Symmetry: C5
Subunit: 216 residues, 5 copies
Amino acid sequence: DYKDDDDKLHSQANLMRLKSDLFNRSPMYPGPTKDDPLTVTLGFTLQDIVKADSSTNEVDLVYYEQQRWKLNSLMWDPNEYGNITDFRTSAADIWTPDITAYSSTRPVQVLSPQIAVVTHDGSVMFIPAQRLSFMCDPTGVDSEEGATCAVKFGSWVYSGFEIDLKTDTDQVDLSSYYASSKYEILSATQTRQVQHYSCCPEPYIDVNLVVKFRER
Amino acid sequence: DYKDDDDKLHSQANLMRLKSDLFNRSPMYPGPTKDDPLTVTLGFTLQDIVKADSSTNEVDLVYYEQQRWKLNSLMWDPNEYGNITDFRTSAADIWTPDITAYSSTRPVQVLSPQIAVVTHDGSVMFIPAQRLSFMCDPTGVDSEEGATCAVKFGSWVYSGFEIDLKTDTDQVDLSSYYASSKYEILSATQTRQVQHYSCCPEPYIDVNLVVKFRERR
Amino acid sequence: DYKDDDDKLHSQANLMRLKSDLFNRSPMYPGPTKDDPLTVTLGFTLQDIVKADSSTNEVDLVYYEQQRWKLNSLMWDPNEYGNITDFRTSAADIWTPDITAYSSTRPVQVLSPQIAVVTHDGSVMFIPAQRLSFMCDPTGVDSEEGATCAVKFGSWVYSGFEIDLKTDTDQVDLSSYYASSKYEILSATQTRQVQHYSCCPEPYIDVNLVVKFRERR
Amino acid sequence: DYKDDDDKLHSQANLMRLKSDLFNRSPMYPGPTKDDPLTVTLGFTLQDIVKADSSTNEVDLVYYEQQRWKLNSLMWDPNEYGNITDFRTSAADIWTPDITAYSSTRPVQVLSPQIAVVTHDGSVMFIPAQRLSFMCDPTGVDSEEGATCAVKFGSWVYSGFEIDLKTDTDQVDLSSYYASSKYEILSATQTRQVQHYSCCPEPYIDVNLVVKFRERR
Amino acid sequence: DYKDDDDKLHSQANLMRLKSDLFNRSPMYPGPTKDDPLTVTLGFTLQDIVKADSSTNEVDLVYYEQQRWKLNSLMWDPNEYGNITDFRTSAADIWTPDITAYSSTRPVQVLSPQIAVVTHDGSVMFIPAQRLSFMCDPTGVDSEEGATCAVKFGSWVYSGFEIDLKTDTDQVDLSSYYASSKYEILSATQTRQVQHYSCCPEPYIDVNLVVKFRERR
């Protein structure tokens, strides 16, 4: 009745207060810096190898790219906000890391909504589905040992001193791989790498996605 | 004359009033939550199987995806708003559910305008036409029993505790299927599913679209 | 000199005034409603059949879709506005009808600018050029009687009670059809249809575009 | 040092002032009208014939389309604005003519930035690079006399009474034509046309681009 | 604890302040002018020749185009801004040069985020990854000496008097070229050119990218 109508409205107002307080908070966050670095955790759920174009050495993957990070400026005490512990918000409403594939051949295509999940400890979780075309020579995919390809993912403009990458595991998550794909996965790994260049002190970080695959 | 000019102006003003009141209403709705959950009803009107690419196992569907939900914050009393019972508004003017195909291979393409219909009880109806490419192996489509493919539709970020899905029927609406398509439909179902993994104290809900099809006779 | 520099400035000011008056007018129009219905006139000038894909039963047309309607809220007296009788404005600056093809297979592509022409009686004319891919089986296009295809056009969310459609004629305008197209037109008609749905007491209107074509002889 | 830092700042402020004065000027220009007509000058620099699709009779051109017009409302005295004689501005910051190809088969693709150059006499120069697909039958391109194609360019909604077109020359500029294209140009002309129709007692103006081409030898 | 949570807050406030000061600074920069010219440094890191279409003479490159320039208006003293020496910002938040390929056949595709890095001396670094389709005849790529193609890059609307170009080296950076590409690079150069045009006493600059490639063996 009216009590339960006012009780829905109360819970709505609490979320509106939280979001309004979180967005309008002063220094509205200017990205990671040296004095204020950040760790982004990457994982891949690999869904399909759609296409292996051997006349251009381009390979087409569909995956979920799972991103995680934690900002002090997204922290709150659930006790002050009607026991709310997490909310969904548009990814355009918040800073997100600029994680890019280093060797793509077409602009990445986003397959899912751009929505992130924020939790009271200030951790954000963003898991967009993408189709990516990248440089990969599929020679020997028609054979038993198959073909092997790699693509690096990392920040585009931030060094290791601003954004650090990590994985929870070396194993690309294959539990959602399309059972009836044209190509089967022999192995898929995601490995953290630290590079260097004697032009410069900065560590440069990436996650190296390596797939071994062959025809069904 | 002037009276029926003033009479059209009157009805316009009423709608303007309703829309302005509805949009400016305080807590301007922040999405479904646990304390304020929502049920979305899904239905499919399947129009065409356009393409079955057997060299990539991608299949191309054109369907109307019909979405329904009800918000208290979209309720009004027609008596207070010149007997207006429903209005059309741009889908960008209102919250809409984030219902996505789980196994698409290309971004979905929208074929129709993005316009929703709102009714005085607070129910919204949104029926976009889409072309979807999804993972589907068409082997045996050239045979009599045909090929079978499935795609799940569900919220992208909301659990069953926030958004619940339901169908009005298991039967995908085939009354608009292109009579002269390259492929004919042997059956098409839409089934509600609840999944429970040992991770999450929340259930997840989805609608499983399953089509059996073959090359035209 | 200065007087015909001022005269051009004057004429500019008058248009500025008209547009500013017209845009700022209170109830800034909320779409057609039952109490305030509208009639949209449709016409097709068919330019080219570009492609007939027989492996997917998709056909590609290029046409001019001519749209017409009249709003009281766009009326003015030219005498009050320096004898201005009509103006061009961006189509995004005004309400336009949501006329869609019901059986497209790809989002329509707009080939022309989105600009409408408004006349003092309140009538708007909007004529976008489009390339449309729609469901059509081209079997027999390689023969003498050719192939026949149809596509319905109509509002996406408005019933006949809100938007009525009408044509000026049954003949699709073929005077601009590409002389050297791969396909020649045997006939092209545009026919008004009144459809009803079992859920819904109100009439729906569409215009049914029917083309008979064959490969160039 | 500080003086030529203050110098650069001064020159920046002058441009700022000019642009701010030019944009904020009252009647902020409402397009050409009968009492305030305009002449647009068209020229084509033809770069490449990329593709001649003989199975759809579509031909793909890459050209620079050079546009010129003059507005009183863009005039200034360089003496009042620190001797500034011209500035670059985004094409979206100013009115531009709605010059379209009448027989395209795909939306035109813009290859260059959308930036115009404005000069103190009020003349604007806008030269976008484009790829255009248009209706053209390439039969005989494989022969010595080659194939001939034409496309008309003109305003979409403005008559000759509002926008007049003109060319500086009949010769399409071929000095930038890709030396190693698959197709060589035998001739390319751009011709002004006045079309009188029966419906409408007003000049319609267009520029007719006519290309004769054949496969490279 | 609280102190190193306040420290992080302090560091954030400092960058907030810097950006806010730099953005709000009066004459908010109007582009390079004759009195206030600019030098853009161009470099190419060539990643892959993906495709050589010999039926249309189009070639597809993927590269990193590295851009550099320096504005007085982006200068700051790190001492006033908590020793901050550089910041990342969206490329849409700042002026960027309009560097275009002069002979592309499709709009360039951007593969990377549009983010620039600004340093206290006022220098900006912007390095977008791109796929470009440009006019190039691949005859002899199937031979030992291979094929040679060229494309000019430069400002679209700015002369040498406003934007000058320069390279750090004549060698296109090949250290990131895809080891297993369909085509291998025999040489790749980037050369500054001063172009003189018939209309125009101001010189125009470009960087000429010249690639010699062949099929891998």
